[PDB]
Short mmCIF file of C-alpha atoms and ligand atoms in Angstrom, two decimals:
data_model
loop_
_atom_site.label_atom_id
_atom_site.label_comp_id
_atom_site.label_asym_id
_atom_site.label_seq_id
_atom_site.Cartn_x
_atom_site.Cartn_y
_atom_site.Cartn_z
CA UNK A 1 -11.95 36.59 27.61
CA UNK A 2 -10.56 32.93 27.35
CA UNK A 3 -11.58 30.01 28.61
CA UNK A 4 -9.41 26.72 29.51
CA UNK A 5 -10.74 23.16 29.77
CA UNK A 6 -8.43 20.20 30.49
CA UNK A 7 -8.88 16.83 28.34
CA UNK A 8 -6.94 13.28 29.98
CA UNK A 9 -5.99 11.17 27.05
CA UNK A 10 -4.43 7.82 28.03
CA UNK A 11 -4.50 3.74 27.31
CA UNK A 12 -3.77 0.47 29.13
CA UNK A 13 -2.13 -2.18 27.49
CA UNK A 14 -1.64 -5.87 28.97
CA UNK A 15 -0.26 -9.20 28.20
CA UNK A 16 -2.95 -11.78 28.04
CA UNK A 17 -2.79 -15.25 30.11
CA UNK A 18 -3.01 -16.57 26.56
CA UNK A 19 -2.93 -14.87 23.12
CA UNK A 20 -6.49 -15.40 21.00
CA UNK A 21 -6.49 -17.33 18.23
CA UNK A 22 -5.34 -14.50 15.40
CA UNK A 23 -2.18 -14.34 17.91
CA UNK A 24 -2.77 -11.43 19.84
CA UNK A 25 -0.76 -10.85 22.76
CA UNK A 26 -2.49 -7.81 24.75
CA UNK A 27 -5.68 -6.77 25.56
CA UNK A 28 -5.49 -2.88 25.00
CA UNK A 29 -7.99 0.73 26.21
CA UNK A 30 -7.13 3.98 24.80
CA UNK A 31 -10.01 6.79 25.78
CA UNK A 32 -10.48 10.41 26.01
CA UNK A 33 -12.05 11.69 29.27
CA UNK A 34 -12.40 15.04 31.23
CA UNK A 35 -10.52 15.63 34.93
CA UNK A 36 -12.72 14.33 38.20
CA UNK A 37 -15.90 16.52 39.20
CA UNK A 38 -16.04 17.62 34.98
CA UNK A 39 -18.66 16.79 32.05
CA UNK A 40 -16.59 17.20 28.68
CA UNK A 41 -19.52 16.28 26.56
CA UNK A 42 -21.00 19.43 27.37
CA UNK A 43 -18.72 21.02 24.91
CA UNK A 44 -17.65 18.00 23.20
CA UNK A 45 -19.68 16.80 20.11
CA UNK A 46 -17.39 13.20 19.82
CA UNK A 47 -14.41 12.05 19.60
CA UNK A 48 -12.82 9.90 16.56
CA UNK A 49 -10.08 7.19 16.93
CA UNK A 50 -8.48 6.49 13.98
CA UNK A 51 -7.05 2.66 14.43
CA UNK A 52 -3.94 1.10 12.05
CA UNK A 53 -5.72 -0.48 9.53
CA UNK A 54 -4.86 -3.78 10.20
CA UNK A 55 -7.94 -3.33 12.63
CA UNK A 56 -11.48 -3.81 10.80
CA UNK A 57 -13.66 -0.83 10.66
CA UNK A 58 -10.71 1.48 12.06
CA UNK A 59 -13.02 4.76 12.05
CA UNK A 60 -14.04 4.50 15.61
CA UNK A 61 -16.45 7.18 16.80
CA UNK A 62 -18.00 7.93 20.30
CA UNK A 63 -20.53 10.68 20.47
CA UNK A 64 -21.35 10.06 24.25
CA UNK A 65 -19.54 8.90 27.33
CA UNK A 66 -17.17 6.86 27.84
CA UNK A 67 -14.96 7.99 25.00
CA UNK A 68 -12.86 4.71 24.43
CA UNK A 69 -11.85 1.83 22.34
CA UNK A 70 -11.02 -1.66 23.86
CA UNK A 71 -9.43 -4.06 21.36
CA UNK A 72 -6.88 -6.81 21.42
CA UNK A 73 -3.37 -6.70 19.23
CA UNK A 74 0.19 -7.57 19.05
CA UNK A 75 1.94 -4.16 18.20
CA UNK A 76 1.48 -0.62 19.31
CA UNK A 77 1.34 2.21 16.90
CA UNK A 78 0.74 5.87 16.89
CA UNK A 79 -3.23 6.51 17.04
CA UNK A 80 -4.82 10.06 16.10
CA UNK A 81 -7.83 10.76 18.33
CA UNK A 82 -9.83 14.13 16.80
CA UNK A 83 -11.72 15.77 19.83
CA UNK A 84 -14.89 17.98 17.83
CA UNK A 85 -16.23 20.58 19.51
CA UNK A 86 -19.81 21.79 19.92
CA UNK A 87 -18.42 25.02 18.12
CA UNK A 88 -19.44 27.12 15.47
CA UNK A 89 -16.05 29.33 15.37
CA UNK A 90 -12.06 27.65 15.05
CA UNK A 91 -11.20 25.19 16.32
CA UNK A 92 -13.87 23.28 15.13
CA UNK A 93 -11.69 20.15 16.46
CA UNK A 94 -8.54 19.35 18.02
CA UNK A 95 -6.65 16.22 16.29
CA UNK A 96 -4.09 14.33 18.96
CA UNK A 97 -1.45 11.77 17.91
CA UNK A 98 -1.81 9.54 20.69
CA UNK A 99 1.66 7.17 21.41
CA UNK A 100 -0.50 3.66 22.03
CA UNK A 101 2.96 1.59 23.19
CA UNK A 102 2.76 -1.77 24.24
CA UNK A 103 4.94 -3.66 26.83
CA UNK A 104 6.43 -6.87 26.52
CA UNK A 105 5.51 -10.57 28.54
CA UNK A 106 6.78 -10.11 31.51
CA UNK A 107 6.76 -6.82 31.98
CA UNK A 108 4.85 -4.32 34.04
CA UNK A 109 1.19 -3.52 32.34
CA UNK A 110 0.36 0.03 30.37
CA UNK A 111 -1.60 2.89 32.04
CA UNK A 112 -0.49 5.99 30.70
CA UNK A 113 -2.01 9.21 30.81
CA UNK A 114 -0.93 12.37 28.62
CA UNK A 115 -3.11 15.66 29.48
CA UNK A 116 -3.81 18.26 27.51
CA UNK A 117 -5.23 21.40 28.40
CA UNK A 118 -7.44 23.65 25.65
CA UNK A 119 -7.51 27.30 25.73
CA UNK A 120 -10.31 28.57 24.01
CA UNK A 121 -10.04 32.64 23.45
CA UNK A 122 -13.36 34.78 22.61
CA UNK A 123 -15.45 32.01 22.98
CA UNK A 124 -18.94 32.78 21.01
CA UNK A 125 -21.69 33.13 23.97
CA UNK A 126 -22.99 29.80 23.56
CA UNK A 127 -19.64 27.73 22.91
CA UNK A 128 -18.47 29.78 26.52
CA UNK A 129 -21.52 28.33 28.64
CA UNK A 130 -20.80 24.74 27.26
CA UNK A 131 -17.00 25.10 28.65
CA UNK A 132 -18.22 26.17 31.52
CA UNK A 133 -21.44 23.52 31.90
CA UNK A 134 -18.59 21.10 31.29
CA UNK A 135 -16.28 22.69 34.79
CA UNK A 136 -13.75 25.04 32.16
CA UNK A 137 -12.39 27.46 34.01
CA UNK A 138 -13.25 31.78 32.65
C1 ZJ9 B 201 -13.55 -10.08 15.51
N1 ZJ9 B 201 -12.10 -9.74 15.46
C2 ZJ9 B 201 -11.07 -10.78 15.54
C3 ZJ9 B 201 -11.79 -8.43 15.32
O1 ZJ9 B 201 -12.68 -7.57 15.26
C4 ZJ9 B 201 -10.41 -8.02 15.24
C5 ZJ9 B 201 -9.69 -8.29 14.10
C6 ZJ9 B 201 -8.41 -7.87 13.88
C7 ZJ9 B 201 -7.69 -7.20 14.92
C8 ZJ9 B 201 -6.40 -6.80 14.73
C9 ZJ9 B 201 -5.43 -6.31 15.56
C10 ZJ9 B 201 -4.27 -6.05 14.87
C11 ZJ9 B 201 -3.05 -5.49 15.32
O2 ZJ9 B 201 -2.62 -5.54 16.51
N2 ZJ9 B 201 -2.30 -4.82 14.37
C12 ZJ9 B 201 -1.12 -4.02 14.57
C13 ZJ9 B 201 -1.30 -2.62 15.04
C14 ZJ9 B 201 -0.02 -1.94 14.52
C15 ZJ9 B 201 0.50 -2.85 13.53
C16 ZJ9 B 201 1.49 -2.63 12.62
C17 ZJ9 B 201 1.86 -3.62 11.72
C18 ZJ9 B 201 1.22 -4.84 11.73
C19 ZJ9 B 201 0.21 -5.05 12.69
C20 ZJ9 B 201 -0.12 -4.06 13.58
N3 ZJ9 B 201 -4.44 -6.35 13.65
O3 ZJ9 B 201 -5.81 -6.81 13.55
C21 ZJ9 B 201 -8.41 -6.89 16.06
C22 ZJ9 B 201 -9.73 -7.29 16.25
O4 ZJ9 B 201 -10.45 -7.03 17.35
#
């Protein structure tokens, strides 16, 4: 009776042409987005990325499309992203800690992906037709 859906997590990281004037070095995009041909927010309420808090406001929240932060920075750190669900019944949400690594000048730019897939068993009637609105597969 389960159903699976697949979630993409990833970031890019780059060196700027020339830091800003705080001293950042990189421009970086970390974002949470479903396979090609899919529509996560059919089951997905939002998704939360929880910043270092050396950033202002660090509670970033996306209820719609695209689900992504772009900032600048000088050091990578480990990010939790919480994925919440248009679900009544556990899980409620899925919490990832997301590896946002930067490179150094000279170096090769960031564009990492790390995918995760969700297996959701005895869906309630209504959370099962979201997974599969959203291309989950039954
Ligand atoms: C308008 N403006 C400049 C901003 O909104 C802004 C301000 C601060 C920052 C910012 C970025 C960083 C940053 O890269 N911090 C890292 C991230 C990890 C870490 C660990 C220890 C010390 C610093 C850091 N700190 O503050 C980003 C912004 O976009």
């Amino acid at each position: 009776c389960a159903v699976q859906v697949k979630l993409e997590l990833g970031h890019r990281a780059q060196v700027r042409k020339k830091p800003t004037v705080e001293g950042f070095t990189h421009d970086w995009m970390v974002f949470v987005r479903g396979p090609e041909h899919s529509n996560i927010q059919h089951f997905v309420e939002k998704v939360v990325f929880h910043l270092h808090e050396s950033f202002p406001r660090p509670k970033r929240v996306c209820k719609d499309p695209p689900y992504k932060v772009e900032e600048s920075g000088y050091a990578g750190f480990i990010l939790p992203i919480e994925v919440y669900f248009k679900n009544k019944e556990e899980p409620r949400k899925v919490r990832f800690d997301y590896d946002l690594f930067l490179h150094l000048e000279g170096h090769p730019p960031v564009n990492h992906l790390r995918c995760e897939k969700l297996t959701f068993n005895n869906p309630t009637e209504d959370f099962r037709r979201k997974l599969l609105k959203a291309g989950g597969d039954a």
